[PDB]
Amino acid sequence: ERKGILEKPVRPQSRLEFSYDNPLIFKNLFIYFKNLKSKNILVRCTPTEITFFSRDQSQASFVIATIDGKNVNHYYASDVFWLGINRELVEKMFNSIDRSFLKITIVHRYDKPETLFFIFTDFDIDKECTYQITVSEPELDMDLIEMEKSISEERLKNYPLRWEFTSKQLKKTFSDLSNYTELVTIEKLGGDTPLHLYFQKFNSISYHEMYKSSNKINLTSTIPKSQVFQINVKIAHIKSLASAMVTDKIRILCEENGNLIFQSEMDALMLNTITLN
Amino acid sequence: ERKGILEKPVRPQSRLEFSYDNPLIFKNLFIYFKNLKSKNILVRCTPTEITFFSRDQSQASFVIATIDGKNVNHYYASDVFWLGINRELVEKMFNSIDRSFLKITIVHRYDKPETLFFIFTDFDIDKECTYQITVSEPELDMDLIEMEKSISEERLKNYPLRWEFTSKQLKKTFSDLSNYTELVTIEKLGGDTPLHLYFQKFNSISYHEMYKSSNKINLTSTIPKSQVFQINVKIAHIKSLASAMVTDKIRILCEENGNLIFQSEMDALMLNTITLN
Amino acid sequence: ERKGILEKPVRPQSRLEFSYDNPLIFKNLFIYFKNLKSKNILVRCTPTEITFFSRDQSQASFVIATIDGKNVNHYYASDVFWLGINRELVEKMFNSIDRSFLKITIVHRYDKPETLFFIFTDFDIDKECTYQITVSEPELDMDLIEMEKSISEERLKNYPLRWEFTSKQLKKTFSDLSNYTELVTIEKLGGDTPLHLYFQKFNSISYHEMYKSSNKINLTSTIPKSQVFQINVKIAHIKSLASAMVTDKIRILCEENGNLIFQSEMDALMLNTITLN
């Protein structure tokens, strides 16, 4: 029963009220955050949506996960405000989410500024589990926040090479890669040509992955026919995304400075990763 | 084909003969014993049943597991006698029980006082696996043994708060709890009120589990309407029970000194845990 | 679409061309090699088949795995030649084989003597994964190679005791055994008698496995009626075989010096282990 964004909150002290009947997305998101070794999660609440921001440990991957108010069962926020969340503190809580829980509710109150409430309801036995999590008023990492604008559809012209993987294909490819390498070359000749993923280790092993049919992986290219697009990229952050299997299918966009953007949409959740090279 | 208690034993030297077509209960019981870190198992044989006694490592939880002779396929014991069993010695043996085994047989002979025989039969290939386990004549822990009387239905009046969990509910609740705490408060106001399980950790996290409908968890209360029942309990031994998932559904009884009794009945097996506070 | 051995190779530089639509056998074979802690794999190519040779770490078990050219989808070899393969180098590659791969292709070229190509094709997305593995020209372990002749059907007369296990029975028996022992006694009286597997550890545990019906495990015996066949054998290498579960059913042959031969046939794969005592 989804009602979207509300004009006024149920409880009068609520600066934020959030409810949603697919709490498993929070588990997967936070498994992703754990795989990235994020220490702290930056949370922006606005009247239209809530956004989770984080870097990975190496600071080179930027993650922006957005849940649109209009797509959940219940949403309310008084204004724009920020919360900082210790990821390790909430790790076991998000992992405890399972199928006995059909609802997740999130509440932040004016009279309790350092507290974030998480309520999970079990409907078979009228059980209600309430977490009270200590949160902070976060110093803002502006570079991370501004990255959100630098993944707008508008700005993605300098990305001549795109394609789509299911989460199983992505996991397979990059787990296979990380068995033997930390870096992989992405190479694609202009024109109707195959996509190459490969690396070479001298006097041991080389590996080469080739995609012969572009339409089977929804590849699109604006590489000039006579040019070769070739970048070298670090793959650990990709395996992290892949393994967390947050969402069904994943769009991959490449640019010639070797930046990678992964986009993934699961229901109310919009997930963006940009990783610099 | 269940025949219950027998007048005379098949083999003439048998002080004990025991056979049963659900050997998986022994696996689960002994997984429970392992989770408790029991070192030694105290075994009482009588002409009507066999009972396994143990404490957990901390000595504060008492376990009494009874298999009634009348409920198995074959039973015989000459008299009352005691055996001590090294739990670590038999650990891998009980764990090796699987579905290829449709029968467990236990024999103790007069001419072999320090030996306990365990025979598992595989009927697909006429395979017979016989363990000969070195056992001892145990010094008796009387406190442990007498506890059996202190869980008689008769004596459980001073237990004003009772309810029932399935093994999945019990595992869920106490694994969720042990993610963050070693102690939990059980609190229940007199009257038609909700059951509370909760704890509080300062400047990090608090958690609160609430059961709104008593009938959904078969709760019964004799707490005086105007009184509050509140106890604090250690939860490790509970997770042990929960995880071993010995039996389908579990009765929980509380008293105001904070003692807990868990009762569980699987077929021929009756399992009682009392844990002092 | 299986065409067997070819007169001439597709690619003109190929000293070896091999293709096969059951690549999972390579995964299992190499899981077996890993369980044995083999360091190096000895590979013989001939115009009719390819054979993998190895010892286990203790040097007492000899493994000979043969894939007959006539039974695969495509085979070609110019002549007889040998390759050495570092097992640890290829370990993750063989383990990455899964159901997305419907074809494995192996190529060795004249112009690249130190290289072995492994190509796996994914047909859902026209994906082609190519490994280039550094290989060597191996010094030959003749004892290992000659063992192949010493498992010919012709030479197996001095093996009076044989029987067959499924891989589940073999795994069960020897995992159960290795819980408690490194050695087991195989004992079988002449005549229509039960097969005994057993061991004895003083003042702890003894175990005895008995097979009452010979026909249920396809046992055959040429032990003279009045004689007792009894050998003691090391079981680690057996658990290795069992666990790798390379093939559906396994023939076990025993001789009185306590040598054991395990034989197993999966499709194109013929697998022989002889382990000396």
CB contact under 8 A, C129 and A217: no
Same domain, A105 and A164: no
For A99, which residue in chain B has the nearest alpha carbon? B172
Q: Token pair 């009452």 is at which residue?
A: C212
- Which of C147, C166, C198 lies at the terminal end of a domain, its last residue? C147
- Which of A122, A147, A172 lies at the terminal end of a domain, its last residue? A147
CB atoms within 10 A of CB A88: 12
Q: Confirm whether B235 is domain-assigned.
A: yes
Q: Confirm whether C181 is domain-assigned.
A: yes
Chain C residues with a Cβ under 8 Å from any Cβ in chain B:
169, 172, 175-176, 179-180, 203-213, 216-217
Q: Write a three-state SS string for A113-171.
A: EEEEEEEEEECCCCEEEEEEEECECCCCCHHHHHHCHHHCHHHCCCCCEEEEEEHHHHH
- Listed residue (A42, A26, A32) closest to A237, CA to CA: A32
* Cβ proximity of C16 and C83 under 8 Å: no
State the greatest distance between any 2 C-alpha atoms of chain B, in Å, as a whole number.
69
Same domain, B172 and B54: no
DSSP C110: T
CB contact under 8 A, C129 and A206: no
* Cβ proximity of C37 and C57 under 8 Å: yes
What distance in Å separates the CA atoms of residue B87 and residue B99, rounded to the nearest whole number? 22
Q: Confirm whether A4 is domain-assigned.
A: no
Residues with Cβ within 8 Å of B156's Cβ and at least 6 positions away in sequence, in order, are: B253, B261
Same domain, B62 and B134: yes
Same domain, B55 and B135: yes
Domain of residue B129, CATH code: 3.10.150.10
Structural domain for C135, as ranges = 14-147
Same domain, B161 and B238: yes
What distance in Å separates the CA atoms of residue A139 and residue A133, rounded to the nearest whole number? 18
Residues with Cβ within 8 Å of C155's Cβ and at least 6 positions away in sequence, in order, are: C149
Same domain, C32 and C139: yes
**A133: which chain B residues are within 8 Å (Cβ-Cβ)?**
204-205
Residues with Cβ within 8 Å of A260's Cβ and at least 6 positions away in sequence, in order, are: A233, A238, A252, A253, A254, A273, A274, A275, A277
Q: Which of A98, A127, A133 sits opposite B210 (nearest CB)?
A: A127
Same domain, A125 and A166: no
Q: In what order do the strands lie in the sheet with C205-211?
A: B74-77, B14-20, B103-109, B112-122, B127-134, C205-211, C195-200, C183-189, C228-234
Q: Confirm whether C8 is domain-assigned.
A: no
Q: Confirm whether A124 is domain-assigned.
A: yes
Q: Where are the beta strands (DSSP E) in C157-200?
A: 161-166, 183-189, 195-200
- Listed residue (C186, C141, C181) closest to C277, CA to CA: C186
Same domain, A193 and A242: yes
User: What DSSP line would sit under chain B, residue for residue?
Assistant: ----B-SS-SSTTEEEEEEES-THHHHHHHHHHHHTT--EEEEEE-SSEEEEEEE-TTS-EEEEEEEEGGGSSEEEESS-EEEEEEHHHHHHHHHT--TT--EEEEEEETTEEEEEEEEEEETTTTEEEEEEEE-B-PPP-HHHHHHTGGGSGGGTTS--EEEEEEHHHHHHHHHHHHTT-SEEEEEEESSS--EEEEEE-TTSEEEEEEE--GGGGT-EE---TT-EEEEEEE-HHHHHHHHHT-SSEEEEEE-TT--EEEEEEETTEEEEEEE--
Residue C269 Rama label (left phi>0; alpha psi -120 to 50; beta): beta
Q: Where are the beta strands (DSSP E) in C24-91?
A: 40-45, 49-55, 61-68, 74-77, 81-86
* Cβ proximity of C212 and B127 under 8 Å: yes
State the pairing for strand pair C81-86/B112-122.
unpaired
- Listed residue (B129, B112, B237) closest to B184, CA to CA: B237
Q: What is the SS3 assignment for C42?
A: strand
- Listed residue (C44, C199, C14, C19) closest to C109, CA to CA: C14
For A216, which residue in chain C has the nearest alpha carbon? C125
Q: Confirm whether B4 is domain-assigned.
A: no
Q: In what order do the strands lie in the sheet with A14-20?
A: A74-77, A14-20, A103-109, A112-122, A127-134, B205-211, B195-200, B183-189, B228-234
CB atoms within 10 A of CB C98: 14
Q: Token pair 């966009």 is at which residue?
A: A253
* Cβ proximity of A36 and A237 under 8 Å: yes
* Cβ proximity of B253 and B272 under 8 Å: no
Q: Work out the minimum CA distance from A77 to partner chain B, whole angstroms.
A: 23
CB contact under 8 A, C205 and B127: no
Q: How far apart are the first and last CA of chain C?
A: 44
Same domain, B164 and B140: no
Query: In a 10 Å sphere around its CB, with 0-12 CB exposed, 13-18 middle and 19+ buried, how is residue B86 labelled?
Result: middle
Q: Which of A89, A100, A133 sits opposite B172 (nearest CB)?
A: A100
Q: Work out the minimum CA distance from A129 to partner chain B, whole angstroms.
A: 5
- CA A251 from chain centre, in angstroms, equals 12
Q: Confirm whether C2 is domain-assigned.
A: no
Number of domains chain C contains: 2
Q: Confirm whether C152 is domain-assigned.
A: no
- Which of B126, B147, B168 lies at the terminal end of a domain, its last residue? B147
Cα A112 to Cα A11, A15, B212: the distances in Å are 13, 10, 25
Same domain, A119 and A200: no
Cα A265 to Cα A94, A161, B154: the distances in Å are 20, 20, 60
- Give the resolution to one decimal, in Å: 2.3
Chains with ≥3 CB–CB distances under 8 Å to A? B, C
What distance in Å separates the CA atoms of residue C94 and residue C109, rounded to the nearest whole number? 21
Q: Read off the tokens for B68.
A: 């009634």
- The total number of residues shown for chain A amounts to 277
What is the phi/psi pair of residue B270, to 5°?
-115, 125
Which stretches within chain C are classed as H helix? 24-35, 87-95, 142-147, 167-178, 236-244
The method of structure determination was: X-ray
Same domain, C125 and C35: yes
**B125: which chain C residues are within 8 Å (Cβ-Cβ)?**
169, 211, 213, 216-217
Same domain, C97 and C76: yes
- Which of C27, C101, C132, C135 is the best mutation test for A, with the most CBs of A within 10 A? C132
**C178: which chain B residues are within 8 Å (Cβ-Cβ)?**
none
Give C188's strand partners: C195, C229
Q: What is the SS3 assignment for C179?
A: coil
